Amino acid sequence: GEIKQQLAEIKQQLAEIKWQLAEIKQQLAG
Amino acid sequence: GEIKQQLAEIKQQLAEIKWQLAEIKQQLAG
Amino acid sequence: GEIKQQLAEIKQQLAEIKWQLAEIKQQLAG
Amino acid sequence: GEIKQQLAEIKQQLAEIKWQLAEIKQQLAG
């Protein structure tokens, strides 16, 4: 239930943050 | 119950981080 | 024990990430 | 035990995010 869904949501957010950071890095590298 | 409250706070902070990174991405690429 | 220490470490990391993002924002604003 | 393993993974991802943000900060300010 709630603990496992919150953990899943957190892991999804961390994945999305990692993508955003990789995109920013690529933008800075041109 | 305590774990649930801490995980909820973690999710909220990650959501705020995502928004801040979306803004930085838009500043660099917009 | 371990659950509470891991949660504390995570909350500290989130705080540090929020500072880094605020610093980056200020750097972009000059 | 499961919570402990997920929290450990969350801490590891946050550490990686911190490093990526330190690099971006250095690119902009260095």
CA dihedral for D8, D9, D12, D17, sign (positive or negative): negative
- Whether C16 is in a domain gets the answer yes
Interatomic CA distance for residues A9 and C26, integer angstroms: 30
Interatomic CA distance for residues D15 and D22, integer angstroms: 11
- Whether C15 is in a domain gets the answer yes
Q: Of D4, D18, D29, which is closest to C17 when you measure between CB atoms?
A: D18
Residue C6: domain span: 1-25
- Report how many domains make up chain C: 1
- Identify all chain D residues contacting A10, using CB atoms and an 8 Å cutoff: 10
- Identify all chain C residues contacting B1, using CB atoms and an 8 Å cutoff: none
Q: Would you give the DSSP letter of residue D19?
A: H
The count of residues in chain D is 30
- Whether C30 is in a domain gets the answer no
Interatomic CA distance for residues C30 and D28, integer angstroms: 11
Nearest alpha carbon to residue D18 among C30, C20, A11, A29: C20
Resolution reading in Å: 1.7
Interatomic CA distance for residues C25 and B27, integer angstroms: 9
CB C28 within 8 A of CB D28: yes
Q: Minimal Cα distance from A23: which residue of B? A: B25
Q: Solved by what technique?
A: X-ray
D4 Cα distance to chain centroid: 17
Tokens matching residue A16: 């999305």
